[PDB]
């Protein structure tokens, strides 16, 4: 039964979604 939601779960998505955005011009992804 699905483990994804709208909550503290977004804290896993958020950091990925800026890391990837950053890593082209900068370090970003870590």
From Swiss-Prot:
It comes from the Eukaryota. Coiled coil: none annotated. Strongly expressed in testis. Detected at low levels in lymph node, spleen and ovary. N-glycosylated. O-glycosylated. Residues 1-25 form the signal peptide. It is found in: Cell membrane. A short helical region is required and sufficient for Cu(2+) binding. Required for normal acrosome reaction and for normal male fertility. Can bind Cu(2+). Belongs to the prion family. This is Prion-like protein doppel. It comes from Ovis aries. The gene is PRND. The chain holds residues 1 to 30 of 178 of the full protein.
């Amino acid at each position: 039964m699905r483990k994804h939601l709208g909550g503290c779960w977004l804290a896993i998505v958020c950091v990925l979604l800026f890391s990837q955005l950053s890593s082209v011009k900068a370090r970003g992804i870590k």
